[PDB]
Design a protein around this ligand. Structure first.
Ligand code: CA
Ligand code: CA
Ligand code: CA
Ligand code: CA
Lengths: 148, 20
């Protein structure tokens, strides 16, 4: 199995809210589809139903927070455990040059529905940018993604 | 870090729910 810290759980609660935009406590196929399409993906209704099905333990058709936590607590089955984090980084690093620019970060924040002013987005870059080049490389991304 | 974790984990959640 696995065990999550209270901090990790709180972080996942915030992530959950980006899917559950109406705040009703559940993620519907429509809500999951909306986020994925905003990020450039194109899941079919059948695929969305399958994704929901995987974690929909009670089978009520939607994903609630407890089920979301299980998703985030499942251990990786892919031999190389870091690909998931590298793939996430590539979503932010739009032009794939290895560094997330403020422009690229603003775009992903907007796509995810994370409403932030340009100034707030610069504060994110500043927190992650340890070497001071004004952008965020993979290593810096890893560090700000760490729960502790 | 919450802004990075909130968004980064949302991206990761999608990755786990879907195949690559
Ligand atoms: Ca909802
Ligand atoms: Ca359910
Ligand atoms: Ca880039
Ligand atoms: Ca940097």
């Amino acid at each position: 199995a696995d065990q999550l810290t209270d901090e990790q759980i709180a972080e996942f609660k915030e992530a959950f809210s980006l899917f559950d935009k109406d705040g009703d406590g559940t993620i519907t196929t429509k809500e999951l589809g909306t986020v994925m399409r905003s990020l450039g993906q194109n899941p079919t209704e059948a695929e969305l139903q399958d994704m929901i099905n995987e974690v929909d333990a009670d089978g009520n058709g939607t994903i609630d927070f407890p089920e979301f936590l299980n998703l985030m607590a499942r251990k990786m089955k892919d031999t190389d455990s870091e690909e998931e984090l590298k793939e996430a980084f590539r979503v932010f690093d739009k032009d794939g040059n290895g560094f997330i620019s403020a422009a690229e970060l603003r775009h992903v924040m907007t796509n995810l529905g994370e409403k932030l002013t340009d100034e707030e987005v610069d504060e994110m870059i500043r927190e992650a940018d340890v070497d001071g080049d004004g952008q965020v490389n993979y290593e810096e991304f890893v560090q700000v993604m760490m729960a502790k | 870090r919450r802004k990075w974790q909130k968004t980064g984990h949302a991206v990761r959640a999608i990755g786990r729910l879907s195949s690559s």
